[PDB]
């Protein structure tokens, strides 16, 4: 891996899509629920159990009653990179923060390159059943 400056910290953000296997009304599509999970270092871990708990928590306040049934998909988008990390959506797993080049952005006042936290976006899709 032609890696020069290795990233220092990665902000891990979360987002989940809920699709019911029983069409209803309260299920308004287009929900933006992106939250900052935690800030981690390369190598650090994130479990599939944590992610679900997060997905379940969210659901508790975005679509009361319903309960997450089966995991549809789990993808990790790393700093606008094209290649993404595909997590096994059909068995428990553990995600390790991927190594990468340190991110940075232009300092508006100076015009020089300044370091900033790297980003990871974990997008999950779960199938839910209207709690009956």
The binding site for a copy of itself (CB under 8 A) comprises 1, 4-5, 7, 15, 17, 23, 25, 28-34, 61-62, 69-70, 72-77, 79-91, 93-98, 100-106, 111, 113, 116, 118, 121, 123, 125, 127
Beta bridge partners of 115: 104
Provide, rounded to whole angstroms, the least separation between the CB of residue 51 and a copy of itself: 11
Nearer to a copy of itself, 53 or 84 (CB): 84
Nearer to a copy of itself, 61 or 131 (CB): 61
**Cβ-based neighbours of 115, under 8 Å, separated by 6 or more:** 8, 102, 103, 104
CA dihedral 57, 61, 65, 67 (to 10 degrees): -30
Closest CA relative to residue 44, chosen from 11, 82, 73, 90: 11
Nearer to a copy of itself, 55 or 100 (CB): 100
Nearer to a copy of itself, 28 or 131 (CB): 28
Provide, rounded to whole angstroms, the least separation between the CB of residue 25 and a copy of itself: 7
9: number of Cβ within 10 Å: 18
Alpha-carbon span 48 to 70, nearest angstrom: 12
- Chain-centre distance of CA 115, in angstroms? 22
Provide, rounded to whole angstroms, the least separation between the CB of residue 132 and a copy of itself: 14
DSSP state, residue 6? B
Provide, rounded to whole angstroms, the least separation between the CB of residue 74 and a copy of itself: 8
Provide, rounded to whole angstroms, the least separation between the CB of residue 75 and a copy of itself: 6
């Amino acid at each position: 891996k032609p890696i020069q400056n290795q990233a220092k910290s990665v902000d891990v953000e979360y987002t989940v899509q809920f699709t019911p296997l029983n069409p209803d009304d309260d299920f308004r599509p287009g929900l933006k629920d992106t939250k900052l999970l935690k800030t981690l270092a390369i190598g650090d871990t994130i479990t599939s159990q944590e992610l679900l708990a997060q997905a379940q928590s969210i659901l508790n306040k975005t679509h009361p009653g319903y309960t997450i049934y089966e995991r549809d998909s789990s993808i990790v988008t790393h700093d606008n990179d094209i290649f993404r990390t595909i997590l096994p959506m059909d068995q428990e797993f553990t995600y390790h923060v991927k190594n990468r080049e340190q991110a940075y952005e232009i300092n508006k006042k100076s015009g020089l390159n300044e370091e900033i936290n790297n980003t990871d976006l974990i997008s999950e899709k779960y199938y839910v059943l209207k709690k009956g």
